[PDB]
Design an enzyme around this catalytic site. Structure first.
Site, PDB file in Angstrom:
ATOM      1  N   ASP A   1       0.825  -1.219   0.000  1.00 32.21           N
ATOM      2  CA  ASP A   1       0.000   0.000   0.000  1.00 32.21           C
ATOM      3  C   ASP A   1       0.861   1.273   0.000  1.00 32.21           C
ATOM      4  O   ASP A   1       1.732   1.430   0.849  1.00 32.21           O
ATOM      5  CB  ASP A   1      -0.993  -0.019   1.171  1.00 32.21           C
ATOM      6  CG  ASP A   1      -2.182   0.899   0.960  1.00 32.21           C
ATOM      7  OD1 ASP A   1      -2.963   0.655   0.006  1.00 32.21           O
ATOM      8  OD2 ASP A   1      -2.362   1.827   1.772  1.00 32.21           O
TER       9      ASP A   1
ATOM     10  N   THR B   1       4.079  -6.809   3.754  1.00 25.98           N
ATOM     11  CA  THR B   1       2.865  -6.017   3.840  1.00 25.98           C
ATOM     12  C   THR B   1       1.935  -6.340   5.000  1.00 25.98           C
ATOM     13  O   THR B   1       1.753  -7.511   5.351  1.00 25.98           O
ATOM     14  CB  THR B   1       2.105  -6.099   2.468  1.00 25.98           C
ATOM     15  OG1 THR B   1       0.841  -5.444   2.571  1.00 25.98           O
ATOM     16  CG2 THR B   1       1.869  -7.550   1.984  1.00 25.98           C
ATOM     17  N   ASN B   2       1.307  -5.283   5.554  1.00 29.79           N
ATOM     18  CA  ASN B   2       0.253  -5.394   6.539  1.00 29.79           C
ATOM     19  C   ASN B   2      -1.018  -5.515   5.708  1.00 29.79           C
ATOM     20  O   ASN B   2      -1.453  -4.550   5.070  1.00 29.79           O
ATOM     21  CB  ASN B   2       0.184  -4.177   7.485  1.00 29.79           C
ATOM     22  CG  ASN B   2       1.132  -4.259   8.668  1.00 29.79           C
ATOM     23  OD1 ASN B   2       1.936  -5.197   8.816  1.00 29.79           O
ATOM     24  ND2 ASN B   2       1.115  -3.223   9.495  1.00 29.79           N
TER      25      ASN B   2
ATOM     26  N   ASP C   1       4.118 -18.396 -39.143  1.00 29.75           N
ATOM     27  CA  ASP C   1       4.822 -19.230 -40.137  1.00 29.75           C
ATOM     28  C   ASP C   1       3.972 -20.474 -40.495  1.00 29.75           C
ATOM     29  O   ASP C   1       2.797 -20.292 -40.826  1.00 29.75           O
ATOM     30  CB  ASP C   1       6.263 -19.546 -39.632  1.00 29.75           C
ATOM     31  CG  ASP C   1       7.092 -20.360 -40.611  1.00 29.75           C
ATOM     32  OD1 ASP C   1       7.606 -19.767 -41.586  1.00 29.75           O
ATOM     33  OD2 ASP C   1       7.210 -21.608 -40.408  1.00 29.75           O
TER      34      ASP C   1
ATOM     35  N   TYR D   1       6.888 -29.441 -44.726  1.00 29.08           N
ATOM     36  CA  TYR D   1       7.126 -28.924 -46.091  1.00 29.08           C
ATOM     37  C   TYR D   1       6.990 -29.981 -47.201  1.00 29.08           C
ATOM     38  O   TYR D   1       7.057 -29.633 -48.391  1.00 29.08           O
ATOM     39  CB  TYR D   1       8.564 -28.379 -46.178  1.00 29.08           C
ATOM     40  CG  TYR D   1       8.831 -27.112 -45.404  1.00 29.08           C
ATOM     41  CD1 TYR D   1       8.645 -25.863 -45.985  1.00 29.08           C
ATOM     42  CD2 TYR D   1       9.343 -27.163 -44.115  1.00 29.08           C
ATOM     43  CE1 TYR D   1       8.955 -24.691 -45.289  1.00 29.08           C
ATOM     44  CE2 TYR D   1       9.618 -26.005 -43.401  1.00 29.08           C
ATOM     45  CZ  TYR D   1       9.458 -24.773 -44.003  1.00 29.08           C
ATOM     46  OH  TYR D   1       9.742 -23.661 -43.268  1.00 29.08           O
TER      47      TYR D   1
ATOM     48  N   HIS E   1      11.499 -12.071 -39.638  1.00 31.16           N
ATOM     49  CA  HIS E   1      10.687 -13.288 -39.664  1.00 31.16           C
ATOM     50  C   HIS E   1      10.245 -13.764 -38.275  1.00 31.16           C
ATOM     51  O   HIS E   1       9.142 -14.311 -38.148  1.00 31.16           O
ATOM     52  CB  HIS E   1      11.427 -14.434 -40.393  1.00 31.16           C
ATOM     53  CG  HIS E   1      10.577 -15.664 -40.506  1.00 31.16           C
ATOM     54  ND1 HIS E   1      10.780 -16.775 -39.676  1.00 31.16           N
ATOM     55  CD2 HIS E   1       9.457 -15.869 -41.235  1.00 31.16           C
ATOM     56  CE1 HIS E   1       9.827 -17.636 -40.000  1.00 31.16           C
ATOM     57  NE2 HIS E   1       9.001 -17.135 -40.919  1.00 31.16           N
TER      58      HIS E   1
END
Ligand SMILES: Nc1nonc1-c1ccccc1
Ligand SMILES: Nc1nonc1-c1ccccc1
Lengths: 546, 546
Positions: B10, B122-123, B334, B465, B523
């Protein structure tokens, strides 16, 4: 001898037929009879609809072509289509209204259970409408129950073309006389009939099932209520998260929507939720069924302290963190039920809602040692037997098939005396070496548990019971709290250890608590009464985990 | 010598301070000055607020106690609280308005990058409000960037109590002089200062960072724009789905919300999306980053036909089926981009929306063989080199580190001539044996790819391919269709193979197509320009994948 059953989709597995709306729309708009059904079938094999059904064009491309056909038909008939006429609106409403024909699906499920190869053969389209998800959901729910789904738009062929029937037979690897083929369109039945297939013209479902029952010699109509769909482990998505250097958690995952984390008990598996996973995912939830720490494919470190509730809960928070989930609904049974109450108490921000099967929420008594508290209740004697490291491991690991078959029984099938277990010298002392198979489980289900427990055995699972003092000290820090997030407590009438009465004061700590209760239900809730469990959980999730 | 930095939540890592609303509410309601801040701190260490912060009670239990304190303060001050006064409404609005202090988080990230151990101390409270998810989301987004999160309500201790500071030091495994401690509350700074820690009182962020920069000797203010958060493979949830007997698909999964399926290209990995996965999950999506068939932990069968687009697409549909997903948004790059266009064409019902990076959608030409079409464009010569089984496998597998370092380069770092590749005799003929590391990748990232490709090598990936004729025949069946579901085409200015110009006619087939364009991008889009990719995808998902 029949060994394959083929069902059409529109008018057979799903009702009301999308085709049926054309007649309805005509009547509602006072249009000449059969006008819309004419614009639809316009041009026959060369027309827009056949192109759609063969996958040449998508449904959105077909809409303006059907619109054009509707006018050409109206012009010939000397009638004018109403001002606000919309083919898109008519088809959106027709597709949305179409639902699975549950008795037809039940019959297909029964035939497959009896060894039949089943398939769906349908004249359908490539749906690119903004509302296409509704139909994708229907197709997903249906297809999972069949060996094959043959869609005209994917195969570039339509019924009644003879090639689609030869394609069906090639797919089934069956000769025509071995095939029952069910359809609501007479014209689509003939080529199958021409090849020598048994054919059923489907008008009303009961008569169609009577013909199907007569021809197959299998009871399909008036049958007992079937069990919910189960899980085949090899067909599930399996997930793995490392929560710390030596610990990984395994889970099975199915569905989309709010995350629902299922937490099994002792000595179980993610598979203990097999009847809940498909049901909850179909109800619109993303199910994460855990292998709890110490079990199955999850890590099983040997140290007792690795299984205290504080550590187990912290790891489940880390599990959410690594998956990128800000919350999940947590549903637990037995030890899993104890974990989910503690998740609600210590991490309410991470718990969307909490539900427990059998395990009550009883605040720790800071004026009594847990050792003293357990001693008071004779049904908890087995927990004292589990204390000494190695004793219960040796008994439970000696014969895995015996262990699971002795444990997993309905309330009227008891083979064990949960009484004076230590004094007797074990859980299985006056127990059969070859217990009979319970009505609750198949031999195949028992062997899945056997296989899972061959990896790590019972050390990690038993360690869940070996942190009484540690769990008590941790729980005492939460005594000033209440559980104020949505909560469900489900009691089981015949669980003789986690008795419904033990939950009687829960509203003092969970004031907004909702309840469920299952009659004639033993300890193994999920597999004892899966239909009732599913009904209770889905109702609660839909109203409170929203 | 400092080696640890501790930040309060806070007023330090998150703004405006939830505490700050008390003063604002007083002013807006014309209440006496400091009244609400008095009811809040009422009773000091024995009061309701300290009990809340130590985890004795939850936030929902605290609300009526704070309400009681507000009256007791108002009664003493001789003022009446306004009629519709709601502590719940005031705190709901304050928590909801609080956001991450981005320059403070950037400084913490930089210190950790430089070897500092970082922590949040933290509180805070146990949040059981109906709206608790907002805060759970904030805590999740923040904590992932730190070594430790110490919350008062989880440790039963609060700042300024001396024990929490000794607890912090024990956690950090550091002596006080090694710790910088940042806080907005003077009283909470003193005990750390008392132990000899370097302390920074935080009022405005710039001054606090100037003090932090001066004391650590690390530039934190005015620094270059940082890269998006990446993925550490060992910290991810890893999923595995068997789509058919010999084929399983692996994926990494993060977040909740609509399913977003990321599909990489050649020769890549799920890890090619490392900069997108955290960003898209934080934007409210459930990310599924695939290892495509042939890659990483996914199966890699040797048969060429296992990699034709029809088979690959059918398996991705099966993947959705097994996960219980009716749809997913499909995003490809791709070869993955080519797959996603075909998913949109053949399975629109399963595709919520489609996006491609670099890969255009060009309908198949039924009057030209794909062999002829590829020959026409000199930039596609490498595809001809990939045809003969074994040739490119041997070159690409000879030295993996060389392969990846040669391939993954920014547009101004080229080491390869994608020209006359066959004639030259390989991709790496006039290429260095020890290429320099590209600005785009670390040595560690290269080694991850090397490690992934050691399992199956390049046969499966190259097989993508080797189905030109088969893919062409399949694609020709879709020539009468249009893509009418939401679509995004993202071009990369400097991709010299998949040039932006190749996408110029896409609107003829995808009339509602949306676009993105990335300047000075080669690419390897996702790793070349991750910030721009993330901005484009998140904007599009939020408007169109809703
Ligand atoms: N061991 C115990 N005594 O009381 N309550 C417990 C407890 C607390 C948390 C988890 C499991 C058991
Ligand atoms: N091989 C081809 N010629 O044209 N279009 C293709 C194609 C079609 C689908 C996927 C990949 C490539």
């Amino acid at each position: 001898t029949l060994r394959a059953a083929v069902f059409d989709l529109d008018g057979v597995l799903a009702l009301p037929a999308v085709f049926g709306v054309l007649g309805r729309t005509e009547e509602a708009l006072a249009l000449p009879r059969g006008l819309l059904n004419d614009a639809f079938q316009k041009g026959g094999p060369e027309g827009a609809t056949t192109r759609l059904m063969k996958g040449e064009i998508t449904l959105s491309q077909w809409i303006p072509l059907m619109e054009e056909n509707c006018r050409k038909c109206s012009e010939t008939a000397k009638v004018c289509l109403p001002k606000n006429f919309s083919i898109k609106e008519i088809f959106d409403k027709a597709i949305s209204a179409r639902k699975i024909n549950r008795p037809m699906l039940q019959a297909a499920l029964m035939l497959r259970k009896k060894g039949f190869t089943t398939a769906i053969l349908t004249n359908t389209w490539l749906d690119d409408r903004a509302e296409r998800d509704g139909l994708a959901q229907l197709m997903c729910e249906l297809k999972m129950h069949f060996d094959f789904l043959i869609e005209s738009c994917q195969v570039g062929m339509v019924k009644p073309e003879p090639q689609i029937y030869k394609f069906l037979l090639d797919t089934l690897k069956a000769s025509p006389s071995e095939v029952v083929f069910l359809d609501d369109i007479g014209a689509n039945l003939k080529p199958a009939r021409d090849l020598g297939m048994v054919t059923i013209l489907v008008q009303d479902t009961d008569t169609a099932l009577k013909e199907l029952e007569k021809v197959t010699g299998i009871q399909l109509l008036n049958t007992p209520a079937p069990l919910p769909t189960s899980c085949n482990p090899s067909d599930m998505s399996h997930g793995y998260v490392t929560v710390k250097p030596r610990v990984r958690l395994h889970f099975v995952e199915l569905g989309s929507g709010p995350a629902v984390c299922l937490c099994h008990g002792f000595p179980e598996s993610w598979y203990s939720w097999r009847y809940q996973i498909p049901a909850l995912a179909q109800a619109g939830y993303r199910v994460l069924a855990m292998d709890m720490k110490g079990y199955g494919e999850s890590s099983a470190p040997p140290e007792i302290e690795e299984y205290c509730m504080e550590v187990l809960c912290k790891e489940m928070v880390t599990f959410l963190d690594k998956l990128g989930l800000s919350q999940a609904v947590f549903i637990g049974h037995d030890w899993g039920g104890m974990l989910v109450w503690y998740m609600a108490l210590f991490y309410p921000e991470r718990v969307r809602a909490v539900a427990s099967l059998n395990t009550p929420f009883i605040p720790a008594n800071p004026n009594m040692s847990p050792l003293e508290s357990i001693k008071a209740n004779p049904v908890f004697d087995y927990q004292l037997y589990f204390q000494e490291p190695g004793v219960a491991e040796a008994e439970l690991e000696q014969n895995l098939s015996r262990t699971f078959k002795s444990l997993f029984r309905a309330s009227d099938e008891s083979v064990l005396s949960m009484h004076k277990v230590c004094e007797a010298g074990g859980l299985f002392v006056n127990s059969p070496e070859e217990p009979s198979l319970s009505r609750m489980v198949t031999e195949e289900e028992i062997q899945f548990y056997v296989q899972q427990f061959k990896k790590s055995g019972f050390r990690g699972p038993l360690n869940w019971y070996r942190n009484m003092e540690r769990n008590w000290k941790w729980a005492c820090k939460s005594l000033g709290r209440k559980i104020l997030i949505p909560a469900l407590m489900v009691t089981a009438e015949k669980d003789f250890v986690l008795v419904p009465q033990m939950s009687q004061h829960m509203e003092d700590w969970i004031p907004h608590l909702k309840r469920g209760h299952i009659e004639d239900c033993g300890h193994w809730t999920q597999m004892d009464k899966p239909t009732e469990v599913n009904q209770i959980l889905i109702k609660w999730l839909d109203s409170d985990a929203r």
